[PDB]
Write a protein that binds this ligand. Structure first.
Ligand SMILES: CC(=O)NCCCNCc1ccc(-c2ccccc2)c(Cl)c1
Length: 324
């Protein structure tokens, strides 16, 4: 494959001491979980259990993510990233790192966020509200990209909104990684629907632009009221869903530009698809959320070529946000 590098914040990590990006050598100091009283279970992840809790020293509500220690290097990576990003705009705040004295299970303590449900928001959200919250996510992404970090799991489930207070938080930094130019990364990241074409064709030299594809997928679902926008049933089918919208010609130009070898599993399923116009996804149910600016902006995010996508900072300058 042809090598590639980020168009923005390319060497931010190279110009920083090893201390900033070397998570394996990071010293984690686990406090005592006795300062927290677990209130109720909020949910359960793949290798985590989330609880609502009270910090007994200051009577404040917190969220406690009890982690199944399946991989220690990955826990150190998440903690290092959360510590580097702590206090950043719209980034979830890691308040503490604790271990229970008897179980010794690792736990992350975060600031409490009073979430508004995905469905409860979906039907009442206005064109302005979409623009406002999209700008809030871009502030979080431009900030973490400037800090040399790729989230690698941007999706609605990882965006918490407190609609009453117009507060947005980008959560779950468990798949996040430090960007180093020329580094080959694992493509088994992000959730199926939000996976960029680079992951699906096994192109490992990806960058922050992966997060911009995922953001594109989220915007398309919101303005068109079609969740998810690219509804694949497996990782191979996911690329077919994208090809049914973006077309197969531009997909072959993308693999040819980077000398990517397509997996033979794509032979019987890819077919031939024309490039669709964004205006065909407009219907009576979503026309109040669509505008020429929204379509031009979406077109500039959902591009096969990761280098041809808007950066978070270029996206913030788009006319789609002139009203915020
Ligand atoms: C801990 C926990 O409860 N997590 C679940 C969080 C559920 N996220 C709900 C959500 C997130 C993002 C959006 C959104 C907003 C603007 C543009 C695109 C998408 C919407 Cl509408 C809803």
């Amino acid at each position: 494959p042809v090598p590639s590098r980020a168009r923005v914040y390319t060497d931010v990590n190279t110009h920083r001491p090893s201390e900033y990006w070397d998570y394996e050598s990071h010293v984690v100091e686990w406090g005592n979980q006795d300062d927290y009283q677990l209130v109720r279970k909020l949910g359960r992840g793949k290798y985590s259990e989330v609880f609502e809790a009270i910090n007994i020293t200051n009577n404040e509500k917190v969220v406690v993510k009890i982690l199944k220690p399946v991989k220690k290097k990955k826990i150190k990576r998440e903690i290092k990233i959360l510590e580097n990003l702590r206090g950043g705009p719209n980034i979830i705040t890691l308040a503490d790192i604790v271990k229970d004295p008897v179980s010794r299970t690792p736990a992350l303590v975060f600031e409490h966020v009073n979430n508004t449900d995905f469905k409860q928001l979906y039907q009442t959200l206005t064109d302005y509200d979409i623009r406002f919250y999209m700008y809030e996510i871009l502030k979080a992404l431009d900030y973490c990209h400037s800090m040399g970090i790729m989230h690698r799991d941007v999706k609605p489930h990882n965006v918490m909104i407190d609609h009453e207070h117009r507060k947005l938080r980008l959560i779950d930094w468990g798949l996040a990684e430090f960007y180093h130019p020329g580094q080959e990364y694992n493509v088994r990241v992000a959730s199926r629907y939000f996976k960029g074409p680079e992951l699906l064709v096994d192109y490992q030299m990806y960058d922050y632009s992966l997060d911009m594809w995922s953001l594109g997928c989220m915007l398309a679902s919101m303005i068109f009221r079609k969740e998810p926008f690219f509804h694949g049933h497996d990782n191979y089918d996911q690329l077919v869903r994208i090809a049914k919208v973006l077309g197969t010609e531009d997909l072959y130009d993308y693999i040819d530009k980077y000398n990517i070898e397509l997996d033979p599993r794509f032979n019987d399923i890819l077919g031939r698809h024309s490039r669709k116009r964004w205006e065909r996804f407009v219907h009576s149910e979503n026309q109040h959320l669509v505008s020429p600016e929204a379509l031009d902006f979406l077109d500039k995010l959902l591009r096969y070529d990761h280098q041809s996508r808007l950066t978070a900072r270029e996206a913030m300058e788009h006319p789609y946000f002139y009203t915020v």
